[PDB]
Design a protein around this motif. Structure first.
Motif, short mmCIF file in Angstrom:
data_model
loop_
_atom_site.label_atom_id
_atom_site.label_comp_id
_atom_site.label_asym_id
_atom_site.label_seq_id
_atom_site.Cartn_x
_atom_site.Cartn_y
_atom_site.Cartn_z
N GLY D 152 63.67 48.93 48.32
CA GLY D 152 65.17 48.74 48.74
C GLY D 152 65.63 49.81 49.74
O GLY D 152 66.65 50.49 49.25
N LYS D 153 64.92 50.01 50.72
CA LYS D 153 65.26 50.67 51.91
C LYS D 153 66.26 50.18 52.91
O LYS D 153 67.20 50.85 53.20
CB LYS D 153 63.97 50.97 52.72
N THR D 154 66.45 48.92 53.06
CA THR D 154 67.00 48.10 53.64
C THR D 154 68.25 47.72 52.75
O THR D 154 69.34 47.43 53.44
CB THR D 154 66.49 46.98 54.71
N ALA D 155 68.00 47.33 51.67
CA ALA D 155 68.98 47.16 50.45
C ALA D 155 70.16 47.98 50.64
O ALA D 155 71.36 47.79 50.30
CB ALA D 155 68.41 47.07 49.25
N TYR D 246 67.89 51.78 62.11
CA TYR D 246 66.66 51.59 62.52
C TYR D 246 65.68 51.06 61.51
O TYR D 246 65.55 51.67 60.64
CB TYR D 246 66.13 52.69 63.34
N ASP D 247 65.06 49.87 61.53
CA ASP D 247 64.42 49.42 60.75
C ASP D 247 62.93 48.63 61.22
O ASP D 247 63.06 47.36 61.53
CB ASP D 247 64.90 48.04 59.69
N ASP D 248 61.98 49.48 61.41
CA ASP D 248 61.81 50.74 60.86
C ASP D 248 61.28 51.69 62.15
O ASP D 248 60.38 51.16 62.99
CB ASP D 248 60.92 51.07 59.72
#
Ligand SMILES: Nc1ncnc2c1ncn2[C@@H]1O[C@H](COP(=O)(O)OP(=O)(O)OP(=O)(O)O)[C@@H](O)[C@H]1O
Ligand SMILES: Nc1ncnc2c1ncn2[C@@H]1O[C@H](COP(=O)(O)OP(=O)(O)OP(=O)(O)O)[C@@H](O)[C@H]1O
Ligand SMILES: Nc1ncnc2c1ncn2[C@@H]1O[C@H](COP(=O)(O)OP(=O)(O)O)[C@@H](O)[C@H]1O
Ligand SMILES: [Mg+2]
Ligand SMILES: [Mg+2]
Ligand SMILES: [Mg+2]
Lengths: 472, 55, 485, 485, 236, 121
Positions: D152-155, D246-248
């Motif tokens: 859930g980093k982008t979440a 930034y992803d990633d």
């Protein structure tokens, strides 16, 4: 007649300059190139041969065209020295970057200079009270000595220093030199605000500290020289003025990091880990200059970065030997919520001797270590079996130990915006008696929570009583 | 009766021990990877550095 | 023309490729126009590789170069005693020129197989934990390996201080001159060390060679070798010497730097192939000479710096293989309160009892073996099970013997003071005393003998052994004191 | 054949090209080949020049023609990029017609000086309670989002964008916060579906998308972050606020280590080059808060790093942490237990949060972060089953309630006014009495109680944004009364 | 622009699949477990089902395929009916023996991909591309980049690894015309998922159909494990 | 029976290094796998038309402390069709030959085993 040359190659922060004349500039010299944006400063590194030299850029090399004309300075990068630098922000090159006019200084010495003679070395065993429990009790710092603050990323190296400046720089009386090497540009600005508000640096009035920055945003050449710039200024007040100076550096690691980026382009054979062969020397010449001499005393608080939390790394591992006091922060302690995350075990000093801090102080400290050590040696057992399997004697030492560890924490005035708890300044005298009282077993009734983020020992019993009313 | 109470507790003691010790294995087993990979990459660097030797 | 001179082709990082010099020897000293001297290590047709002893900001392309015609040597003799010199042997303490008697090269061949003697002469280190378990012998090299901030230097330092017992004497064959070799250390530390020696009137029989980090890599590399020649001097004139290297770990890093910069292919971790040969031809230089040679001797206490307690490392293994044993020091034991933190389990002496004092040899025979049993029982009582009379008896004594071995720094103890303590330990007179009592017990017991039973201390000292009569009196002196208080 | 603005290809391979000529070319200057492929003079040598290939080397043949652009690599910047999806060059890839750019900016910009800056003080509501309570983000802050695969980093970054819609649709400008998502090393579908979700929530209108798919050449992924950065820098200088994610970045370094290794550069830790730090360094520095003289504009950055096995001790990760102003680690374990977002309060940190957090939250949430830190220490220490005292048990009951309260479903952003109330109850202990399985329903039922009754309190915390000494009392009597029923 | 804006489920024909770990249309599926679990039997199945429900052909690609197994596979496929000589075949075979040089090994995959894309852009079918095993594809690259002289990355793998993986996975997607679903096996080097090769592969995988021995041991066919089988399209 | 392939690789590594060819994992050139794969695949079972002839291969690999994860072993184990893993420990107990039933496997199995023994095995 000014000596002039032409560029032959441009690879990254490394530009090769060639001179038609048969006179070549020595090593460690400066160079300048005319640009629409301003002027680009170069620094000689080595003579490749054939009237060609290798130099290190001080700024971006974008736009440089091969064969462009290059003017010689005639001397190693120098920077203004004297009381005129105080209350001013100097750049790696030695020019004002605070938009307040040029530094009208009397003299201008070079950043490159040889380390003090062995006969000039002066040793001292005077204690320096900081107010920090985990320090003034375990590894006390010495006046005009070398301080080191190791630790991985986000362990508390700067916040630790900021507090030292909030407690020593104020009641100091001498001069100070802060130099941010390869650090967040933002932290520099906020640092400027603090010096103004606290009144350490008054624009209209006088100031007590000079600000030299070579932030990480700046290219490798700068991140490599900035440390030298800041140091030149402080060695002035040391010999010329002969007055106590506080040299704050953060972070010193960037010095070798910045040099390991170019070592490759310089044509050096990478040593193990990628670091340049001459790690020991370069780092040597730097630390040897940052010391107290028979002309003046200087207390340096250098922060060291620990790559991948590895203390065996050649960079930090060669730093310990250049320090009279070492305070290592383990992220394994900060994650526990304990701050500062000082590791009592690994932490060492040269002042931890009964012939200086007193016999009692020596004994109390030792007892604290043994207790903490015995807790660590049984840690494996605890995760597997538990305390139920621990013997009566061992189980009592754990609790006591855990009490001592939590007690080590201390609210920081600078980090109040993180803990939400007002700073707590504790004197060395009270700290010793405090732990000693805990060792005697005079507080084994008080709950551990009452030791967490507590200042004075009195505040422990106070906080213990407040928890009685909260129990429902 | 107090014997039946020891076995009952001891059966609980070694149950959590296997769970903690067991789960501890799934933690060190990860450190055995990063440390295995580190030795494979490090030994490889000396081999490359010994061959990249020029003038 | 260019036979005795040459022009510099390139220069940087302390390296200088000079052209010419077609009559210079291998490893020969040279001088540039700038004043800075250098050393030739790589001989090639095109150019000659030279390493600088000083900064290189002074050398420039096309500069003149001259040769010395002689292999890099250093002044030697008694004169150096009490003086502090650098790699080359020049004074750095500021107390006049070095009055040397002769000059010997840096690289000297190790003593012959024929001109040797088995080590029989002890080396009182004043450390009970040491002189009792891992004794030192005049002519051997006892390693002091351990991590940073443990107490490596300590062991060595105290030794030098202990020598004051005989160096102030008239007899020569009994004295023992000391050579400290600081390498990689900062000038700050060296200054404080030399200060401490003087605070104990130990500087008069001590020579110090400084090769601080700031100096050029070739200095740190040459420092130990030259320093050894200094000490070899006594060995040859029928005197005894004691050299301490601190530390070879830095020296290899230095020597690694010249190699890489001279563009010499690295082996493992960038260290030069012959990195072993760096310490091998150094330590072998110290040994006991034949009676024909002078009965002279040179003892060596090499120091190494491990990372994270990893003795399986590249450099350390290289030296463990050469040294006549090692005094392992663990950080973990230090906190536990074992100071000096000597791990008996891993610390050994290859010369063994041959080197140990005869008197102390009797009182502690299987003591090391007993301390091995202690750790065996100490680990097994971790189970939390009750212990019988046997396993608890040895556990009681083994726990106190470990407490008796703890000795404070800067506090060397004579032989006449070690024997009595160990005696009361191995036997079992401390078993009936509390652990936190062993501390003051030592001091009290000593003061007891120095006042009453002082005759015995005088016999043990001179004789150095224990007779049937001396044991009787010593036996009664112990029991009588236990009864007291 | 003008060897001043054009040259010939000497050789090609490994994604590098050595062209002969171009004597008037600038360092790092954009170029074009006969095939139409854009390159960049990454290095200049006498007699040849190194050019990186932004396309497949198939299209580059040996002996072709090479023309120069005369300008360093730049990308179109302006308000016309809003709602439009471009690549690393700034060209449209969505097919909605060419981009309306106001100007062109260098791909490599230097971070603002130290003087033209100010400390962050503008809160940036992410919609997440556990976030804007423990580690809040402010205009000009650099909050890292570290975590393992599918954690859930982008979440956390995605929900932030959708929550900005509450101010982007307003009249005022200083309240609006533009968004610029950066996708590098990701899949085509992964980005396409990501865009679709933005259109469904009508958030694409105020968002710019920059693409650097894995299929695209490594260098594209290398220049994608830098260019995308300049797109948002525009809003900053105009006195507006932007937000780039930034992803990633972790993949980038991998793409860069490629060109790094291909160009033959001494390997470092984990095969990453020594200058890997200067990579992310130069990029993040360009995100801060300018002074009022500059325009009072800012650029908040949200870099993302993917670790392995929950290893924050890795190289890449630590390098980023030593730059960003706090991290939000996402442990997998907590993610499987349902605890989502799986924010690990233990490793989560905010170097400038309270400074840019609503005072309404600073009051109700005091020492909540440190408490949770100590919570896991006692919680994971009592999970053995052993019995504890009242002190540890009391803290263990309150910790569990707070942990469950931090939980929140995705796509469910809550107003600060709605968050303040929830935190207050947790610290006081009103929740303690409440059952653990009723904590979820309680939150949804408690909010309705205020809206239906004490709505006045909600409107006060909204505008004022601080809890006075009077509103503090009106709130307590309002929650206590609800806890009882 | 040719990419889709929505992921849809691809009906396979197995309850254990559609209900637990469904196949993503134009996604990458990971198949674990070697021989003994009827891997081959589970493959020919997906080829038949899709051929009757979606009528899309299939393409089998073998990278460093064991010449032994390649034989028994071909022969088995003629016995099941997925491949008829006289009638009409449904799946194309493209094997790349192990006794072949790295050059060929690292291209086998692309060879099979090409043929599959044809029926995607021409006939617009839901073609399935089988790759066994995606691991030897990374190994192949590693040997090739090794001989070329390129410096070895972390763990020894090639630096270019990151880009190569994408020059194969990205090409497998659902377009406006047709779609290609990839069903490629996965091998875990030394039972370690931290390793680059696996780490990189999983970054594209959308679902995983595990085949445990303990599942076929209970007489459960296929040997698909409900607990291990997961999908990124298992949401409301 | 190739006894042993481990030694062969070492020899080949020596030639490759001396010839200055690119060094890979553990100093083995990229074609090291192509070596053994092009050797083991030579043995097989010819069909009836080819002559029904057959060549069996029993390659021997020496591990270093049970490390089957090493480079060379991983290559070989990947190509063969089963292993007869042997452990020194099992040897000491008395179990000789020490064939670790747990690890030892055969992909062909009963396909090549006498039914007289298969019925009891
Ligand atoms: N016998 C002892 N008892 C108590 N403390 C000691 C003893 N010996 C040394 N120490 C303490 O240990 C600290 C470091 O000791 P020492 O100088 O021996 O370590 P070291 O091996 O030299 O480490 P380094 O090589 O980094 O100097 C000193 O501060 C000293 O006070
Ligand atoms: N708060 C939440 N509650 C429930 N499910 C969630 C929550 N946050 C994320 N998820 C689920 O986790 C899945 C993984 O997607 P997500 O982007 O969050 O992982 P990620 O770590 O960001 O992956 P990547 O880093 O590769 O983009 C999402 O599809 C989403 O449904
Ligand atoms: N004395 C302290 N008490 C509580 N937290 C601290 C303390 N010192 C540092 N920290 C933590 O460190 C964070 C800032 O990190 P910093 O100290 O700048 O790390 P670095 O050493 O990498 O600069 C803060 O969020 C704070 O919580
Ligand atoms: Mg910092
Ligand atoms: Mg020392
Ligand atoms: Mg993500």
């Amino acid at each position: 007649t000014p000596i002039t040359g032409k560029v032959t190659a441009v690879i990254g922060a490394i530009v090769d300059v060639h001179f038609e004349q048969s006179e070549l500039p020595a090593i460690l010299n400066a160079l300048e190139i005319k640009t629409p944006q301003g002027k680009l400063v170069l620094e000689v590194a080595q003579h490749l041969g054939e009237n060609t030299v290798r130099t290190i850029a001080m700024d971006g090399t974008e736009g440089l065209v091969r064969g462009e004309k290059v003017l010689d300075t005639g001397g190693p990068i120098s920077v203004p020295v004297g009381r005129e630098t105080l209350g001013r922000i100097i750049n790696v090159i030695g020019e004002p970057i605070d938009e307040r006019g040029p530094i009208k200084s009397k003299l201008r010495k070079p950043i490159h200079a040889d380390p003090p003679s062995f006969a000039e070395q002066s040793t001292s065993a005077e204690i320096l009270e900081t107010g920090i429990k985990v320090v003034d009790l375990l590894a006390p710092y010495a006046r005009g000595g070398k301080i080191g603050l190791f630790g991985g990323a986000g362990v508390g190296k700067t916040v630790f220093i900021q507090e030292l400046i909030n407690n020593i720089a104020k009641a100091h009386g001498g001069f100070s030199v802060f130099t941010g090497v390869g650090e967040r540009t933002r932290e520099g600005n906020d640092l400027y605000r603090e010096m103004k508000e606290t009144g350490v640096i008054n624009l209209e009035g006088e100031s007590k500290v000079a600000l030299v920055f070579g932030q990480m945003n700046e290219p490798p050449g700068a991140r490599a020289r900035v440390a030298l710039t800041g140091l030149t200024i402080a060695e002035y007040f040391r010999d010329e003025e002969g007055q106590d100076v506080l040299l704050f550096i953060d972070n010193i690691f960037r010095f070798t990091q910045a040099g390991s980026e170019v070592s490759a382009l310089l044509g050096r054979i990478p040593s193990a880990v990628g670091y340049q062969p001459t790690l020991a020397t370069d780092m040597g010449l730097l630390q040897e200059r940052i010391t107290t001499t028979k002309k003046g005393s200087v207390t340096s608080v250098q922060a060291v970065y620990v790559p991948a939390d590895d203390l065996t790394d050649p960079a930090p591992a060669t730093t310990f030997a250049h320090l009279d006091a070492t305070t290592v922060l383990s992220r394994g302690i900060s994650e526990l919520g304990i701050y500062p995350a000082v590791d009592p075990l690994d932490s060492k000093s040269r002042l931890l001797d009964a012939a200086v801090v007193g016999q009692e102080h020596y004994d109390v400290a030792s007892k604290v270590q043994e207790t903490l050590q015995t807790y660590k040696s049984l840690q494996d057992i605890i995760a597997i079996l538990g305390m139920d399997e621990l013997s009566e004697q061992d189980k009592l030492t754990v609790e006591r130990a855990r009490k001592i560890q939590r007690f080590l924490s201390q609210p920081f005035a600078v980090a109040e915006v993180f803990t939400g708890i007002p700073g707590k300044l504790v004197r060395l005298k009270d700290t010793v008696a405090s732990f000693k009282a805990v060792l005697e077993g005079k507080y084994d009734n008080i709950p551990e929570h009452a030791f967490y983020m507590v200042g004075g020992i009195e505040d422990v019993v106070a906080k213990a009583e407040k928890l009685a009313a909260e129990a429902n | 009766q107090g014997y039946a109470a020891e076995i009952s507790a001891r059966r609980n003691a070694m149950d959590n021990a296997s769970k903690n010790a067991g789960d501890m294995i799934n933690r060190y087993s990860i450190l055995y990877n990063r440390t295995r990979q580190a030795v494979i990459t490090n030994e490889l660097v000396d081999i490359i550095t010994g061959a990249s030797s020029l003038g | 023309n260019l036979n005795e001179t040459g022009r510099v082709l390139a220069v940087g990082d302390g390296i200088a490729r000079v052209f010419g010099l077609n009559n210079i020897q291998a490893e020969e000293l040279v001088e540039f126009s700038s004043g800075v001297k250098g050393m030739a290590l790589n001989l090639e047709p095109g150019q000659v590789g030279i390493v600088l002893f000083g900064s290189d900001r002074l050398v420039k392309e096309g500069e003149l170069v001259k040769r010395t015609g002689n292999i890099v040597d250093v002044p030697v003799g008694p004169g150096l005693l009490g003086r502090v010199v650098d790699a080359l042997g020049n004074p750095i303490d500021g107390k006049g020129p070095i009055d040397a008697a002769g000059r010997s090269r840096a690289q000297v061949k190790a003593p012959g197989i024929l001109p040797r003697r088995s080590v029989h002469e002890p080396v009182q280190t004043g450390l009970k934990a040491v002189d009792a378990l891992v004794p030192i012998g005049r002519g051997q090299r006892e390693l002091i390996i351990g991590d940073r901030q443990t107490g490596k230097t300590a062991v060595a330092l105290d030794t030098i201080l202990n020598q004051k017992r005989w160096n102030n004497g008239s007899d020569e064959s009994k004295k023992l001159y000391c050579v400290y070799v600081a390498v990689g250390q900062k000038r700050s530390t060296v200054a404080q060390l030399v200060q401490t020696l003087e605070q104990h009137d130990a500087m008069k029989y001590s020579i110090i060679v400084a090769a601080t980090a700031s100096e050029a890599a070739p200095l740190q590399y040459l420092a130990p070798f030259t320093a050894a020649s200094i000490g070899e001097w006594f060995r040859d004139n029928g005197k005894h010497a004691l050299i301490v290297y601190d530390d070879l770990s830095k020296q290899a890093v230095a020597y690694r730097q010249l190699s890489l910069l001279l563009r010499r292919p690295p082996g493992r971790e960038a260290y030069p192939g012959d990195v072993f040969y760096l310490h091998s031809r150094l330590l072998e230089r110290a040994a006991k000479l034949s009676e024909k040679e002078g009965s002279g001797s040179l003892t060596a206490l090499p120091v190494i710096e491990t990372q994270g307690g990893d003795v399986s490392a590249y450099i350390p293994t290289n030296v463990i293989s050469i040294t006549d044993g090692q005094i392992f020091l663990e950080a973990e034991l230090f906190y536990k309160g074992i100071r000096p933190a000597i791990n008996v389990g891993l610390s050994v002496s290859r010369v063994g009892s041959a080197a140990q004092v005869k008197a102390l040899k009797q009182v502690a025979g299987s003591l090391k073996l007993f301390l091995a049993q202690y750790r065996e029982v100490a680990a097994f009582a971790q189970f939390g099970s009750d212990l019988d009379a046997s396993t608890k008896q040895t556990l009681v004594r083994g726990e106190r013997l470990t407490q008796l071995l703890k000795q404070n720094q800067y506090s060397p103890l004579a032989t006449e003071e070690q024997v009595p303590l160990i005696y009361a330990g191995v036997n079992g007179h401390l078993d009936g005393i509390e652990l936190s009592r062993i501390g003051e017990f030592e001091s009290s017991f000593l003061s007891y003998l120095k006042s009453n039973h002082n005759e015995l201390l005088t016999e043990i000292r001179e004789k150095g052994e224990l007779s049937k009569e001396l044991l009787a009196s010593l036996k009664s002196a112990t029991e009588s004191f236990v009864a007291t208080f």
